[PDB]
Design an enzyme around this catalytic site. Structure first.
Site, PDB file in Angstrom:
ATOM      1  N   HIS A  18       0.812  -1.226   0.000  1.00 35.25           N
ATOM      2  CA  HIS A  18       0.000   0.000   0.000  1.00 35.25           C
ATOM      3  C   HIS A  18       0.852   1.287   0.000  1.00 35.25           C
ATOM      4  O   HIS A  18       0.322   2.395  -0.157  1.00 35.25           O
ATOM      5  CB  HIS A  18      -1.064  -0.017   1.097  1.00 35.25           C
ATOM      6  CG  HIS A  18      -0.540   0.251   2.476  1.00 35.25           C
ATOM      7  ND1 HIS A  18      -0.374   1.528   2.979  1.00 35.25           N
ATOM      8  CD2 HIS A  18      -0.193  -0.596   3.476  1.00 35.25           C
ATOM      9  CE1 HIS A  18       0.066   1.454   4.224  1.00 35.25           C
ATOM     10  NE2 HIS A  18       0.187   0.175   4.549  1.00 35.25           N
ATOM     11  N   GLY A  62       1.572   6.888   8.545  1.00 32.23           N
ATOM     12  CA  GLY A  62       2.950   7.391   8.413  1.00 32.23           C
ATOM     13  C   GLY A  62       3.989   6.355   8.822  1.00 32.23           C
ATOM     14  O   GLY A  62       5.149   6.458   8.436  1.00 32.23           O
ATOM     15  N   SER A  76       3.351   3.191   8.101  1.00 36.61           N
ATOM     16  CA  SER A  76       3.079   2.204   7.047  1.00 36.61           C
ATOM     17  C   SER A  76       4.337   1.736   6.373  1.00 36.61           C
ATOM     18  O   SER A  76       5.168   2.564   5.978  1.00 36.61           O
ATOM     19  CB  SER A  76       2.200   2.833   5.964  1.00 36.61           C
ATOM     20  OG  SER A  76       0.915   3.048   6.461  1.00 36.61           O
ATOM     21  N   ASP A 106       0.143  -7.659   1.793  1.00 41.08           N
ATOM     22  CA  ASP A 106       0.577  -6.252   1.789  1.00 41.08           C
ATOM     23  C   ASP A 106       2.100  -6.145   1.934  1.00 41.08           C
ATOM     24  O   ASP A 106       2.621  -5.802   3.001  1.00 41.08           O
ATOM     25  CB  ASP A 106      -0.147  -5.473   2.901  1.00 41.08           C
ATOM     26  CG  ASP A 106       0.060  -3.967   2.809  1.00 41.08           C
ATOM     27  OD1 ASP A 106       0.564  -3.484   1.778  1.00 41.08           O
ATOM     28  OD2 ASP A 106      -0.292  -3.268   3.791  1.00 41.08           O
TER      29      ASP A 106
END
Ligand code: O14
Ligand code: CA
Length: 223
Positions: free
Chosen positions: A40, A175, A177, A84
């Protein structure tokens, strides 16, 4: 990171900032020319920033290296966030030293109860918004799959785990991530998703890196 602590400059030497004019995601250096992040976090024009503490100040240990290619997992689903994970190759090899270092991939999966270190430059507030300039850290346990699934019914796949505190107050956040979850010197997780941040009964959800080691190794071997 909400409810964490200031890591200390270059104490997390595998932590990278992904920059496209501004910090937008974390990542983990896994060798001199490859970074693991969240799918992502995918976008074009990524510059990888190593050796960062204050992301707004050049302090002397940085290496800024443009990405030459990104590889999103072949089975990444942006709606469910299943798979992910993304690999990012650097245009040139990073210079590895004590302050810029790779992190080992796991050879087996971690268990519930294992303590891990989660880090990043994400939001520090569970309600408002405040972005730190220096790297923040959180020590947190991996949660049982049963408690993870109970927290997020119908959403937890075999490629995800929860870590954190069901009481709330301590979590990763926006942030963070793509950043690392490191347990006994191994990269076990990637900051993936959650409902808000540091909310009661809503722990962080992390990509289960041990499931991807075969794919990571084979991908690196041919790219
Ligand atoms: C594209 N895009 C999706 C929304 C936002 O990403 N949100 C990440 C995130 C990570 C962790 C947590 C948490 N542990 N509670 C909560 C949220 C910004 C990036
Ligand atoms: Ca800096």
């Amino acid at each position: 990171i909400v409810g964490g602590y200031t890591c200390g400059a270059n104490t997390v030497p595998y932590q990278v900032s992904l920059n496209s004019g501004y910090h937008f995601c974390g990542g983990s250096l896994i060798n001199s020319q490859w970074v693991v992040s969240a799918a992502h976090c995918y976008k074009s024009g990524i510059q990888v920033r190593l050796g960062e503490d204050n992301i707004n100040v050049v302090e002397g240990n940085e290496q800024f290296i443009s990405a030459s290619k990104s590889i999103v997992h072949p089975s990444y689903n942006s709606n469910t966030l299943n798979n992910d994970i993304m690999l990012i190759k650097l245009k040139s090899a990073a210079s590895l030293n004590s302050r810029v270092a790779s992190i080992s991939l796991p050879t087996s999966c971690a268990s519930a109860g294992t303590q891990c270190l989660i880090s990043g430059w994400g939001n520090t507030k569970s309600s408002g918004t405040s972005y730190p300039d220096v790297l923040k850290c959180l020590k947190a346990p991996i949660l049982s799959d049963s408690s993870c699934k109970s927290a997020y019914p119908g959403q937890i796949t075999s490629n995800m785990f929860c870590a954190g505190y069901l009481e709330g107050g301590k979590d990763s956040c926006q942030g963070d991530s793509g950043g690392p979850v490191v347990c006994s010197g191994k990269l076990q997780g990637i900051v993936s998703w959650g409902s808000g941040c540091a909310q009661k009964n809503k722990p962080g959800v992390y990509t289960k890196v041990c499931n991807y080691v075969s794919w990571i190794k084979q991908t690196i071997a041919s790219n």
